[PDB]
Chain A
Amino acid sequence: MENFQKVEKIGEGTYGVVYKARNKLTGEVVALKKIRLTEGVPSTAIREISLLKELNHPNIVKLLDVIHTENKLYLVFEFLHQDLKKFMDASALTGIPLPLIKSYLFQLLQGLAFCHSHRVLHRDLKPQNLLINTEGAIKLADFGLARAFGVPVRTYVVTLWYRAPEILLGCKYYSTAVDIWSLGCIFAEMVTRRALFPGDSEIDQLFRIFRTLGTPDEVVWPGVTSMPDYKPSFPKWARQDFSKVVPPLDEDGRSLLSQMLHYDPNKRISAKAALAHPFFQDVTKPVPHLR
């Protein structure tokens, strides 16, 4: 711990504080996550550490070290230049170019396919948890809510806007599909510059999803009318033409997005399968313009 120089605060929350820091001996720039620390090591830190240690992939943020004193606990991460949320705002006037959207989605799916095939669910995929550098990389971050699904993970979380319909309807278990739902929402947000389903509440969130994608029935999604939080009195909305939901997308993007937003979590495309979608046939690695 004496080898690190604090440069500046980069975040704060219930966990503790996050600092940009420098290694005094090697010069390495790092993100220091400091956990306050009589309840012991927090459950989220136990999970975040043991899961990330297993996950070495170029599109997942590296845990560089864990320093465990008697009364403080530090998580040392590689440092990236900003989050997608901050990038999307900077891009509000100009837009993010479509080849860069494609590159980002492609890399996000690679990181996620890696997580999923290593039995880790992320569960909290949102623009501010995705980190970018100036050389065109995007990486999943904040595995504070991540879970190993060697056995199925029961439902308790994730911010509302990116929450899958099956969770809102009160399914018993999570599945990999919840993460794909989140990426699909983020994909559309990059394209339109607007949150796809920005709800005030759980019920407003469902209703926004329904108004766009159609109110699901037993044909579309078997078992749906039997789910704990389904109501017969739900309004029955028509599905909307995707050319009106994400106008600047070609046929291939609309295809992928609708498969990512598929109602039935059993038939919602996987990250693995999404990587082979004709949408990524001409994927390149463009460099973003960061402020």
Chain B
Amino acid sequence: VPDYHEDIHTYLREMEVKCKPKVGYMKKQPDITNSMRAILVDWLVEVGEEYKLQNETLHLAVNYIDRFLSSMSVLRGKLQLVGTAAMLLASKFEEIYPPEVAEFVYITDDTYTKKQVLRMEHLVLKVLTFDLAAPTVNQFLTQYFLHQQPANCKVESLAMFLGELSLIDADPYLKYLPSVIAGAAFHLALYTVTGQSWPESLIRKTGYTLESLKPCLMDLHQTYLKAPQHAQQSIREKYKNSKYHGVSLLNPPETLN
């Protein structure tokens, strides 16, 4: 149905500001680092694959983690507990039916108990004040994909691929709103596969020019180019599947003009 797309987009654009984490939060965490966060998110990707969860679930979990770490000091030995609870919450929100708690304790490799996961769930809910319906890069791409002429599954998968990569590296991606990252991921995927650009209809709809997407595009291009050399490889492995048309094997362009 066409009627509601504008209102929804406007609403998500409004909501993504309210649901954003603090950009300099990691500097204020004395025991945890960007690198540790990267390890965690990469692991969650694997968890998603192993339990066949939606990509939206992964995206939401990362948002919860980043928001939680924006106001609570966490020690390195407890980071994974925050991670698991966020994934569980994300599953409960997004999945048709989530995995039961026991399955989430299983993936921690007996590091934490059932009781611990459930109490962390309660804590995260308290800290997030039950506001779980966060807009995600995934949501925006979904909206943007309706402006394809015509639709291209390679483009979609690559955009999804690039968007997921952005989850791994808090530096630089916490600087950008989901609508912006999605803007970049969409144009880059479009450019790589079809040679087309960020289309006029999306400029009008989003207010973003290609020029305004440039700073994020330059970062995402760098991420894309350096992806085979990144310490975290779960996302590339995920996107080798025919399910995603093996897009992580596609050569990125050398420049963006």
The interface of chain A, by Cβ under 8 A from chain B, is 38-41, 43, 46-47, 49-51, 53-54, 66, 68, 70, 116-119, 148, 150-152, 154, 156, 175-177, 265-266, 268, 270, 272-273
| Residues on the B chain within 8 Å of A151, using CB | 54, 56, 138-139, 142
CB-CB under 8 A from B136, the residues of chain A are 150
Within 8 A of A (CB), among B1-36: 1, 3-4, 7-8, 11-12, 15
The answer to whether A150 and B135 touch across the interface, beta carbons within 8 angstroms, is yes
User: 14 A-B contacts, Cβ less than 8 Å apart?
Assistant: A40-B88, A43-B92, A46-B130, A47-B92, A50-B93, A50-B133, A54-B15, A117-B7, A119-B8, A119-B11, A150-B135, A150-B139, A152-B142, A266-B1
* Residues B127-168 near A (CB distance < 8 A): 130-133, 135-136, 138-139, 142
Cβ contact within 8 Å between B131 and A53: yes
Chain A's nearest CB lies how many Å from the CB of B119? 9
Interface residue from A39, A53, A265, A268 paired with B130 (Cβ < 8 Å) = A53
A54 surroundings in chain B (CB, below 8 A): 15, 133
A116 vs chain B, min Cβ distance (A): 5
A119 to B8, CA, bound (A): 6
Q: Assess whether B130 is in contact with A49, with CB atoms less than 8 Å apart.
A: yes
Cβ A43 vs Cβ B98 within 8 A: yes
B66 interfacial by beta-carbon distance below 8 Å: no
In the assembly, what is the distance between CA of A166 and CA of B54, in Å? 23
Q: Is A51 a contact of B1 with CB atoms below 8 Å? A: no
Please tell me if the beta carbons of B11 and A118 are within 8 angstroms of each other in the complex: yes
B8 touches A66 (CB 8 A): no
| Cβ distance B137 to chain A, nearest Cβ, rounded Å | 11
Q: Is B47 an interface residue (CB 8 A)?
A: no
- Chain B residues with Cβ below 8 Å from A117 are 4, 7-8, 11
Contacts beyond the supplied A116-B4, A176-B3, A273-B3: 5 A-B pairs with Cβ under 8 Å:
A38-B118, A40-B118, A43-B98, A150-B142, A268-B1
The residue of chain B having its C-beta at the shortest distance from the C-beta of A48 within the complex is B130
Complex Cα distance, B126 from A66, in Å, reads 10
Contacts of B7 in A (CB 8 A): 117-118
Report the minimum CB–CB distance from A153 to chain B (whole Å). 9
> Chain A residues near B240 (CB, 8 Å)?
none
Contact of B132 among A50, A70, A177, A268 (CB under 8 A): A50
A65 to B54, CA, bound (A): 31
Docked-complex contact B126 and A156, CB < 8 angstroms: no
B122 touches A41 (CB 8 A): yes
User: Which listed residue, A47, A176, A266, touches B4 by the CB 8 Å rule?
Assistant: A176
Task: Check A39–B100 contact: CB distance below 8 A.
Answer: yes
> Which A residues lie within 8 Å of B100 (CB)?
39
Q: How far is the CA of A51 from the CA of B139 in the complex (A)?
A: 16
Bound together, the chains give a CA A266 to CA B1 distance in angstroms of 5
A119 / chain B contacts, CB cutoff of 8 Å: 4, 8, 11-12
A40: which B residues are within 8 A, CB to CB?
88, 92, 101, 117-118, 121-122
Q: Does B89 contact A (CB under 8 A)?
A: yes
- With a cutoff of 8 Å between Cβ atoms, the chain B residues found around residue A177 in the complex are 1
Find out whether the CB atom of B101 lies under 8 angstroms from the CB atom of A38.
Answer: yes
Min distance, Cβ A60 to any Cβ of chain B, angstroms: 15
Name the CB-closest residue of B to A120.
Answer: B133
Are A50 and B131 in contact, with the CB atoms below 8 A? yes
In angstroms, Cα B117 to Cα A284, docked, is 53
- Chain B residue, CB-CB nearest to A175: B1
CB of B210 closer than 8 Å to a CB of A: no
Which of A50, A150, A175, A177 is the most central at the interface, judged by chain B CB atoms within 10 Å of its CB?
A150
State in angstroms the CA–CA spacing of A175 and B1 once bound together.
Answer: 8
- Check A46 against B93 for contact (C-beta < 8 Å): yes
Let me know if A150 and B8 touch, CB within 8 A: yes
Q: Which residue of B lies closest to A42 (CB)?
A: B92
Q: Is B205 an interface residue (CB 8 A)?
A: no
- 8 pairs of A and B residues whose beta carbons are closest in the complex: A117-B7, A150-B139, A50-B132, A270-B3, A43-B92, A40-B118, A49-B130, A46-B92
Residues of A with C-beta under 8 A to B97: 43
Inter-chain contacts of B138 with A (CB < 8 A): 150-151
Query: Measured between C-beta atoms, what is the minimum distance from B234 to chain A in Å?
Result: 21
Say yes or no for B231: interface residue by CB 8 A criterion: no
The CA of A41 and the CA of B117, in the complex, are separated in Å by: 12
Q: Which residues of A contact B135 (CB under 8 A)?
A: 150
Contacts of A66 in B (CB 8 A): 130
Q: How far is the CA of A70 from the CA of B96 in the complex (A)?
A: 27
A270 contacts which chain B residues (CB < 8 A)?
1, 3-4
Tell me the B165-217 residues at the A interface (CB within 8 Å): none
Closest residue of chain A to B91 (Cβ to Cβ) is A43
The reply to whether A156 and B1 form a contact with Cβ atoms under 8 Å apart is no
Interface check B74, CB cutoff 8 A: no
